[PDB]
Symmetry: C3
Subunit: 202 residues, 3 copies
Amino acid sequence: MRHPFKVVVVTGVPGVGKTTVIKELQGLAEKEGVKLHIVNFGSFMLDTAVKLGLVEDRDKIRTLPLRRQLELQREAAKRIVAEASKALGGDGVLIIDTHALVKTVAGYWPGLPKHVLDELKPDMIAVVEASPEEVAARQARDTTRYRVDIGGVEGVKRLMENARAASIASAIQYASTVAIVENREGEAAKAAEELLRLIKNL
Amino acid sequence: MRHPFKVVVVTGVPGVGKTTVIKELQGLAEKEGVKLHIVNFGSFMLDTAVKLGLVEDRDKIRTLPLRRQLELQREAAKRIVAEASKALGGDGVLIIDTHALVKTVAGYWPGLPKHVLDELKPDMIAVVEASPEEVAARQARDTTRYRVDIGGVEGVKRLMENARAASIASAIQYASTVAIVENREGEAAKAAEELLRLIKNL
Amino acid sequence: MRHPFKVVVVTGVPGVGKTTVIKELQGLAEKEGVKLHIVNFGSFMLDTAVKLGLVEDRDKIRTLPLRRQLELQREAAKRIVAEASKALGGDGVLIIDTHALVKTVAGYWPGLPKHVLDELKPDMIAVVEASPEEVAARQARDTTRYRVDIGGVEGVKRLMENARAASIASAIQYASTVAIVENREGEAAKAAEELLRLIKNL
Ligand SMILES: Nc1ncnc2c1ncn2[C@@H]1O[C@H](COP(=O)(O)OP(=O)(O)OP(=O)(O)O)[C@@H](O)[C@H]1O
Ligand SMILES: Nc1ncnc2c1ncn2[C@@H]1O[C@H](COP(=O)(O)OP(=O)(O)OP(=O)(O)O)[C@@H](O)[C@H]1O
Ligand SMILES: Nc1ncnc2c1ncn2[C@@H]1O[C@H](COP(=O)(O)OP(=O)(O)OP(=O)(O)O)[C@@H](O)[C@H]1O
Ligand SMILES: Nc1ncnc2c1ncn2[C@@H]1O[C@H](COP(=O)(O)O)[C@@H](O)[C@H]1O
Ligand SMILES: Nc1ncnc2c1ncn2[C@@H]1O[C@H](COP(=O)(O)O)[C@@H](O)[C@H]1O
Ligand SMILES: Nc1ncnc2c1ncn2[C@@H]1O[C@H](COP(=O)(O)O)[C@@H](O)[C@H]1O
Ligand SMILES: [Cl-]
Ligand SMILES: [Cl-]
Ligand SMILES: [Cl-]
Ligand SMILES: [Mg+2]
Ligand SMILES: [Mg+2]
Ligand SMILES: [Mg+2]
């Protein structure tokens, strides 16, 4: 079970370069006439959380009580699909910038649980990956975002292993591909090209 | 989808110290006024198996034909939730001492398959972990339990890797957290404190 | 939820020796009077794809657009169960020669997604394994099949790790066992005996 448009969920650990690679994919897509609608799942959760006076910062969402995060995750998924449905026809691709596994105050939490996959029905779960050392250096240089709680090189390495396993488990629900995209240091454009090529085979 | 009470499923390989850490969590919980109802999933399966004359020993359950184990697993999950429902209100936590993966006579068998998760609806799957060598030494010193079939250090190591993967797959169904709890040699009380802290963020 | 017959899904990477080990299991089964019905999931997909003029070669199926592969996978699973239902009673075992993870043109693709498991309801997912080096040498010596796209020793190693994780995730849906069967060089008959022994405990 599939939407009329294609759905690509882009995951990977905080700081790996998802939002960067997606911004490169946007330029490449419009150059080649491929129709995208691009959203950030976290921005949809932040919108609701800010309205409820729960947080002001996207990096505090994962510190909320988990039953509250569950409600924000459910509502974000439904709003994303309603918006995608108005923006895209059968020739379009929904790109969702998100996480397969979130490091919360009560443990590793699936970003693509069954209730979310029942809304998104992904054609593909892309996993953006780099070395733990590369990810830790990208986190250090990016002072716009708080990622110290991910636990530097050792925390990144563990989250990456658990996140790969979550991506595969989530793929079983709607027979999503799992596409591993290497985001090599200084080569975000090349990651975006490899991702586009896989998207064209969906 | 959630019960009115919180549900914490405590997994880890045989001999790792689940039942020990849960006994420490019970003391700490009652000291801090946190309401628990604590069950052992295997004890619920043993009750039915003994009534049917199938086994007399909890360590022989995993040697039954798998269609029989499937029936005992289904009934144990339903009985646990019926009992929890009478014991707990919205301020309580159900603690289920169990396994994400059981080493049976027909291979590794999920302890938290979808039919079980549809009953338990876990807020959290805690994974109690130690080194394979620590687990093998704990099994050797505990002569109350038969665990030789788990396969000592090498068998424990493999089951641990497969069990981590099963815990994450099971977490996708109801967006359960996966909380890794280190049960360090001689520090079961500290594992119980780390678990309690995560439980309070559910 | 179970068929009246037992269902064993036999997975492992291309070239590992699934079809070989199953041919040995067939001889051993008929020698011991164990009733099997044996199918190849890919042959069911090839039948439909050839009728539609899509491919002529079983090794090109994984190069089709993924929405097309999804339709062929759904139809293959339904046809297999309809045929098994006419061939087997409650004393029989359906053996399905297939894959937990297929390396496609749009990434790693689950062979046992939920829509497939809802048809097959496996008692067991057997994982046939060997060293990546053994698998790469078996692929080189077998010129009847195209497997260069799996990526030799390094590609085999990665697919094997991801395929193990997919097998476990797929096992959660219907509480299937996961039985790891070592297909050691020159000992396909012994792998078939170990598999038969596990099958008899279902
Ligand atoms: N291939 C690359 N090489 C070098 N720097 C990169 C690369 N890709 C991204 N970066 C940088 O890494 C930092 C993190 O990138 P980005 O914000 O896109 O990560 P993210 O995965 O979206 O993280 P979050 O999940 O926290 O939103 C940024 O400063 C970005 O410019
Ligand atoms: N942190 C610890 N350090 C040392 N010994 C421990 C620790 N935790 C538990 N033990 C001991 O390890 C042995 C196994 O513990 P326990 O029976 O609680 O394991 P379990 O995980 O419940 O096993 P099963 O799954 O077989 O029931 C016991 O003798 C127990 O006292
Ligand atoms: N244990 C073994 N030792 C040596 N060679 C083996 C062994 N098992 C299988 N082979 C050989 O390995 C090659 C691949 O075997 P086979 O075709 O059965 O693999 P497969 O897993 O069914 O692959 P595919 O998934 O591509 O169909 C064949 O030439 C086969 O004879
Ligand atoms: N699929 C998801 N499920 C749950 N929480 C999510 C998901 N995607 C994003 N988030 C949350 O949103 C925050 C901000 O998103 P991001 O900008 O991608 O880091 C993350 O740190 C998470 O707390
Ligand atoms: N969730 C479960 N699913 C299936 N079998 C279980 C489960 N939990 C416990 N068991 C069985 O019960 C036995 C005794 O439980 P324990 O005392 O935790 O070792 C285990 O060895 C298993 O055979
Ligand atoms: N369960 C499955 N799901 C999807 N594709 C499959 C499945 N089983 C087999 N295939 C496809 O069928 C081809 C031929 O099967 P095989 O002969 O086992 O290699 C594989 O290379 C795949 O492209
Ligand atoms: Cl992720
Ligand atoms: Cl476990
Ligand atoms: Cl496979
Ligand atoms: Mg981002
Ligand atoms: Mg115990
Ligand atoms: Mg074959």
